[PDB]
């Protein structure tokens, strides 16, 4: 099968820090060019406007990072490698919003660039809907050769960990494929 990362029935909290780490799972990320996050989540009704949802970062370059996140309740994406310079096109007026408070999806999906996708191609997707693609470029971890850390929630940048909320995440699955936009709306 596809899937190389699944956990289920976590939370994020003041317990933790906010923070669920996963970065014992950051050698099967590391090397994927064809990938889909998935996570099923339900965000607290009283969550800051921006925060993660799931990241890849770097205690040594705090501006090279990967991020879902939900940001005024639109669920946008950021991949910014070595020289801190985007991957993706923007995403934080994309079109589709979570509900808070409530139970919703978001799934992620990258393609590596082929002779049919010369660019790549990137996906965000919100309760199984497409919010937007992007054409910019199909990097992902491979392209980020500092990162160190794995987590839902409040993600480790230099020696700080921002972006926390109170989650509570019934399923976070990582493939390595790209689910298709049918594959996800079935998925979710």
Known sequence: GAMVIEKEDVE?????????????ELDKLKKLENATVHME??????????????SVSSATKKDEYFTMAVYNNTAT?????SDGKQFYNNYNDAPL?????????VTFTVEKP???????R???????????????????????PDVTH??????????????????????????????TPEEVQKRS
Not at 100 to 105: A, L, M, T
Not at 114 to 120: C, D, M, Y
């Open 12 to 24: 994020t909290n003041a317990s933790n820090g906010q923070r669920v780490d996963l970065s014992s």
């Open 41 to 54: 989540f339900k965000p607290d009704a009283k969550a800051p406007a921006f925060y993660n949802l799931f």
């Open 77 to 81: 994406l950021e991949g910014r490698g």
């Open 97 to 105: 919003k979570v509900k808070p408070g409530q139970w919703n999806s």
């Open 114 to 120: 082929t002779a049919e996708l010369p660019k790549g």
């Open 122 to 144: 990137v996906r965000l997707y919100v309760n199984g809907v497409l919010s937007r693609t992007s054409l910019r470029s199909g990097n992902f971890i491979k392209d980020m």
């Open 150 to 179: 794995v987590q839902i929630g409040a993600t480790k940048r230099a020696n700080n960990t921002v972006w926390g909320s109170n989650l509570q995440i019934r399923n976070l699955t990582v493939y390595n494929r790209a689910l």
